[PDB]
Design a protein around this nucleic acid. Sequence first.
RNA 1: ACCAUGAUAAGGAUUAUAAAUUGAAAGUGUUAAUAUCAUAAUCAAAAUUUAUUAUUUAUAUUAAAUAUGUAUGUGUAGAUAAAAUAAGA
Lengths: 157, 154, 59, 55, 211, 55, 102, 259, 133, 484, 90
Amino acid sequence: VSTGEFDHPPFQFRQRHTFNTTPLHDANRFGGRTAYLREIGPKKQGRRFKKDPRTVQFNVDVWCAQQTLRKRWKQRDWEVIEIPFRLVPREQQRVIPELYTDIPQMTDPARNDFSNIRNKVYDREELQGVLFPAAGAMLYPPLQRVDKQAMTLDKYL
Amino acid sequence: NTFLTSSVATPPISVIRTGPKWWAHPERMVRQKLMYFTLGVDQLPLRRTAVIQRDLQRFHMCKPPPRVGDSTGYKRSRAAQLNTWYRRIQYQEYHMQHLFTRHVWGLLRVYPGNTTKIQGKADDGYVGYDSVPFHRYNRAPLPFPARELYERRK
Amino acid sequence: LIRQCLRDIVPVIEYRNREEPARLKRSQAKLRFRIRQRLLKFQRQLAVANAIASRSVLY
Amino acid sequence: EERIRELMMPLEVGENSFAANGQATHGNLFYFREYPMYPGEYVPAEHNTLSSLRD
Amino acid sequence: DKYRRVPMLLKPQQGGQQYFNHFLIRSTNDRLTQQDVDNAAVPPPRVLGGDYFKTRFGYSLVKNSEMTQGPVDYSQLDMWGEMPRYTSDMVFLYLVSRRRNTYAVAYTYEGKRILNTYTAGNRSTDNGHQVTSMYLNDLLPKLREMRASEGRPMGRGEKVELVVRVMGFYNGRQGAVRAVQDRANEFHVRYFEDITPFPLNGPKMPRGVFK
Amino acid sequence: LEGAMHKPGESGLQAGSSTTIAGKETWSQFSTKMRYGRRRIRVIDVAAKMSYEYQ
Amino acid sequence: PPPTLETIMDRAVREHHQHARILSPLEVQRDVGRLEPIPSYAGKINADRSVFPFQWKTEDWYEYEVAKVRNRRFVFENTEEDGIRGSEVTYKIVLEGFWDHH
Amino acid sequence: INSGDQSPYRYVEERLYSKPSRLDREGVKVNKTYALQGLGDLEPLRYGANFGISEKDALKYETVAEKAKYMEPPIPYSSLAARKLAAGALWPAAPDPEGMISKEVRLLRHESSMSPSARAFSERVAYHLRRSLKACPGHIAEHIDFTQLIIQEVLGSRRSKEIYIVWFTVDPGARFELEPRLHQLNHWVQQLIIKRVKRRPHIPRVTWIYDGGRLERELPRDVKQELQSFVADAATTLESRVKYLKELDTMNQRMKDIP
Amino acid sequence: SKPSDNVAWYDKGPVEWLPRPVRLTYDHLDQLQQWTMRATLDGRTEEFNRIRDLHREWSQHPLMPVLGDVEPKFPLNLFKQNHRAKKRFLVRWHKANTPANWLWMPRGPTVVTPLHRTNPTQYPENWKQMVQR
Amino acid sequence: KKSLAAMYMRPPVTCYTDACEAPVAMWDGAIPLKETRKLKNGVPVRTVSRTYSHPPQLTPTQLSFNDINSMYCVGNDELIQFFPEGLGGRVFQTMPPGHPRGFLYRKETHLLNLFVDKVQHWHTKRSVLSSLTNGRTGFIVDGPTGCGKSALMCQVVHFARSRNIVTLYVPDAKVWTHGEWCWPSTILPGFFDAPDAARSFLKYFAVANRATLTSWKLRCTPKDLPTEQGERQPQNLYELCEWGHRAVAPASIDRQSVCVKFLMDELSEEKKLPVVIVVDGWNLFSHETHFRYPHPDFLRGLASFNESSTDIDLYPQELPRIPASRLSFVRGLNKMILSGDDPNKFFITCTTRDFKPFDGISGFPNVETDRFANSLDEYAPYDPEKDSHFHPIQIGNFDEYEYRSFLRFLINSGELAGLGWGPLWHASSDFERKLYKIGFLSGRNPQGVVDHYHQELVWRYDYQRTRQKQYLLKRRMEGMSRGA
Amino acid sequence: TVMGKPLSLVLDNKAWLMEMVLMPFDEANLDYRDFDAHIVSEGHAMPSIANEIAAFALRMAVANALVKLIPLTRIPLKKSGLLSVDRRRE
RNA sequence: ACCAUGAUAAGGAUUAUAAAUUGAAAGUGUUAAUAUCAUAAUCAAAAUUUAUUAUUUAUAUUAAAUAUGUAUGUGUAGAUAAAAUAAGA
Ligand SMILES: Nc1nc2c(ncn2[C@@H]2O[C@H](COP(=O)(O)OP(=O)(O)OP(=O)(O)O)[C@@H](O)[C@H]2O)c(=O)[nH]1
Ligand SMILES: [Mg+2]
């Protein structure tokens, strides 16, 4: 669910800066990207593409796809490294179908882990023996994991 | 504020006749309360504007009964008495919004639109980067760049 | 006032130019009483339409 | 605080009390019932009619 | 517009069906409490003494002159016994309203004209308002000069004691008296009456009045 | 009131903000001098449009 | 989650200190003048977030709706199986006419 | 009730109380069903079947004197009269008393709208009212506080059938002290108009209108006529006046055709 | 220079009349929250009193009138089909009715109000001056 | 009709919250007035009192175990004393200058309040504090968005600065990481600075702990600092911070880089005084700041643009992003965290979830209607156990006990201060309807409780007061008919 | 939950839209916390249904579900008009 | 090709004695004005395509000017979610 604007406003008579009324090509709409298709004054191939409804809708569909791409790439705190089949963990020793090939696969339902394998992200400090066997100096420190059974401040002791 | 174009003014009776569309839109009316709640003042003309328009939208689909005839003009004049009372309250909140948001804009160093008066900074209509190169109503040429209403450092 | 002067005579001009057609015992006494009452009331309205047809109007 | 508010309820149109119900325009648009809507609502019968049939 | 496609249950939108069963049990309870009750304009406040009654008002009941007299005979009744009791230092302000004019005169207790009659030509509702306002602006130093000639200072704290009398039944009657009502710190009006002519016979009236 | 009179400094399409009465004309009188003063025809350019016999 | 501390206190107040157990809204005899036969699913349905209500991550829903339409005709009809599903040959005769009753 | 491009009140009034409606009730074969057919106790008692007035017997008399002379006395009691007696509908219920409250109306008519004889008559009423307002009956004058009374103007109709004296008070809270007693003076004002005022077009009905300074005057006549000449569209009024001249010429030609 | 009726004279109030359409954002509310955060922690209370003086002046309850006139003092049934003449009337009629010319808002200092505190000493910014004595 | 307003007298004001009472004509029907009869030189003594009073203004030493899930307040003079930096991201949205400065005392708030009570004498309670943090340097507080994260962090500085402990308080970490502009460090090679965030940090930290930093003798600080005519060389840590931020531009840009580095060097050597370091939004300090590295063509130098083999003015490009570890402020923090020779600094910090929403697709945000206009553009997942060395504390939304106490403070004390319905109390519902409804709209989320409290104005489908006024008008007309 | 997302995130935390979903529960004199509800959108798919016309159909879907669960719920729900369908298009 | 088409405007009537239903809405008659080119002997208007100093309405370009005085339309359009200065003589 997203509350941003996706469609372009239609064509009518020339709007004015009023209450609940913005001009059709303004710097506020779509982050100022309408300056490519705006007219300041209140050459035939360079005038008619600004007034075609299918043409101005396709450009917003490109700009909204650019906004969809940059937020999907800013979510990536990981990267894809081709790891061979022998040094991979036990949940990746299975036959993994490609994207949109099968049902979205659970990781391992036998161990009560119902999650998609395609969104599984492994920490880099776990695979130091696989990714860096040539260094031999432990370039990344081990992850300090907190003791869940230790009496701490959250357990009133 | 990124709306710096020249604008067209509307009479206040055309604003309130929109009703739930723009004047009493609930997303707009709740952020007008947060302006008054930040400054520590009563939202008293705003709440009584909202209580009236809450009940006005409740019966707005009902058709009025046919006025079959009265010898004296009593309930017709009384229904118009309450109707002209509801407009004067919403005339006050229409003035209360425009007074306070121009007082807030003088504090936050935010420049208004064209030909807009802020009482603390620019008593005349502040015009910045207009299509017409001179003042629209004061008949004076605009300098380049735009007029600095505030000091420099943030 | 010019539009008031226009709204009077232009219905007479458009009448002539555009749409003018081609030319060429007491109970019965009460019925005559009501018809004479109807024509005495609208005598000034009917006198103009006969005068436009008979072309007698001082402009 | 609800026992005190019911005695100071502005039942009449005053300064901050606005009708706005269309009571001046339409008049009495909201219904009100004094009977229990059977079988959704229940009020027990009075003892005068109970003692009348019992006697 | 035409809301004929809208159902009849959606047009008033009668909500709050949860509370109705709450109210009837609220009613049949309270009647029983009435059975538990059934089986089981205003005068002004009191004055106690005259010493602080002198401080509550601007006068005193007990006279301090100590008039010692022995008139055993029956006292002489006044001609107009049921009237306002006009003391000696009271100025009678006469406001005469007309259609196009409003006049304001001030007389003493004995009939001496204090100030000349102000006219709109000389100096409606606001017409009479401004005429009697500019009359009361000039009436204060003339009153102070006419009372200071005998020994009455009237400087601080003393309000000018006024009796207002109006003529006309016109619009200028409205704005005149209001322009005395804002002068409450200066002019204290005690008797606000009117002086309106009773048409006893009348000499004659012009032709446009009759026919 | 405001806008009831027309001062000669202000233009006719705009509205004056002054409330004074002296030195101002009414809008019935302003409509008279606009109907009175507007008698002239703009000069026809002779050299811009050739004559029909030449064409 | 487990039930809240206000919930299990207010129930145990009425269960123990008031001697009247709090019953489910499906156990309330709302019809006055009628006794309902109290169906068996009144309080026996366990509240688990895995079964109801349905809330998911959106990217699993984005993967589901694209994989369901692209795998439409990825079906093996003639399977070595039981009855009406399983067969050896499958004949489909698509009849086309201008009227639905034709 | 189906209106048919009319107000429903006037349509039901024409279908109930007109002369072709009651003649269709008696039976005349009028054009198409001018009366209401099915009515029970809501039928008026004038047009009942057992009543003593029948318009078919009254159509043969040419004069009201002949109807008063020759017709039988009406039948007093009927079944519909019994139902209206049981319902209490023999006399209408008394409305709210309009004698002493006010005359609240939206606007006030200008002096340019009324006749010049109406302006002269209203000026005479204003003169004789402001002259002799102390010369009222003394049992009403003992309660009227004349210090607050203001008579600002007198308005009238075009033939002076009713007069509206517009009044207010200095203090508005005294208005309810001067409201009922001023409505006890309507016959005194009428006798003052009969006595003092000559050339009176009608002996008028007196109505008091409270103003307070607030009630607004209407526009004058010439400004309203110029507004209707400046604002209203020329095409619709143009074709309506042309069609009116067509109807007038057609009536002239039909009057010329009949010898 | 194309003169129009949109001049919006800056005389009869702090806001110009026939005012321009203004729009509030949540970015304006976040800057106003940060401005009042800094103004309270700096001790600056003179800007708050100017807001409260504008609030006390213009947010009074309008008087509940008696019967007799309506808000269209001029009858708006004359403009039936001339739509552009009706909106040009409504711009000019609301231009003459300035906020100084409301006359139903008790704006002036002659009025008394038990709702809002009038002097800035009554506000809790100076509470140690009138604590108990 | 039953007013009881003229008979009401004002109680004596003892604190700032008692002076926040509005005139009685405002809250007469909002907060109703009851009357009690005392036996004082006569059997009736009519004493008209309020049903609701303000929650008590208490110092943190007076807060106890019985005040858990209750409401308390702080003074306005205590607010300007203990918070010169400000408050969290959304904490001050409920405190205008007319409103009292209230705070909810939760059960996790009580655990941290007794923790700082042991931090105040840490050398005798060292084995206690090591077992509480499980040997870590401090606590990180993580949860969903809009819960009591920054609202708890401003309470910790209220707990510690009232116990006269020196506190490093970062009120919001988006001034450092997501700042206006980034400048490289003058004395630290390869490191960067947030200069506008540093001058505000060096200003308010000096005013906050002026009682302790004036007694702070400079141990490892060079005495040949650059100093203009008329200024004194710093001999205290308070004088060092006033040397840094109090200067003229542009000389304040390089002065803070010297001051912040020497502040972090002075704090890391002190092993005797407890220094609590509270950071709002440690997850911004645990990953990359939004600044990027400059292109190397800007520092290389060019003769012309047409023949230089560059496109810096032609096409933009994304350089690798600068991490927070390369900032001079976070370098001194990470020096004290990782090096085990400091059993003296307690990092009670938290995270922020103020990022924008993104749920698969995204259009453009409307400029007028955007609640996330000043939100962070990160979209990154965060795990406090894997991305921080602190002990994670998981706080959820409110339960119905503290949600009732928080909503009672919002509704009643808002109308008592003259900021709520007031005379329009008859249009809004009672408290039990509002508690039932806002708990549905918010899900007892603390930001949603504050947001739907303002959205209570635009409720359309509440029919409680309509049916109540119908019943009371019906009951009135039959009561006078009984009297007739 | 509406289409896998909670109601505070579907209708963008708007109180005047989400209170129509509560309206089948309060008119029935019922607590909303004793019921779990999932609403599936079968009409035109949109990225945001934050409007009063979509919340009208969200009210009717819950109100028809309350009648099928408990049959005596239909007596206050029909009187409040929550089960009434209007026919208005664009 | 001189047929007697067809469009415009105007007035009439019938039903709701229910609080249920998602939804109390649907069927039937008369007068004025305008108008009427098909049983016969042909052919390329814009059947129809293309181009030049030239005729328009639109398309965008497109500026000075405070010495005084000053400049109001009919229409064209998009989806459609306000309403009582005129006499049922
Ligand atoms: N007075 C008071 N308000 C609280 C308390 N807990 C939560 N709130 C309210 O809840 C809202 C959330 O406050 P924050 O702590 O800033 O929310 P957050 O978890 O930091 O949100 P993010 O920064 O986006 O992660 C605030 O606006 C407060 O009004 C509390 O204990 N006392
Ligand atoms: Mg936070």
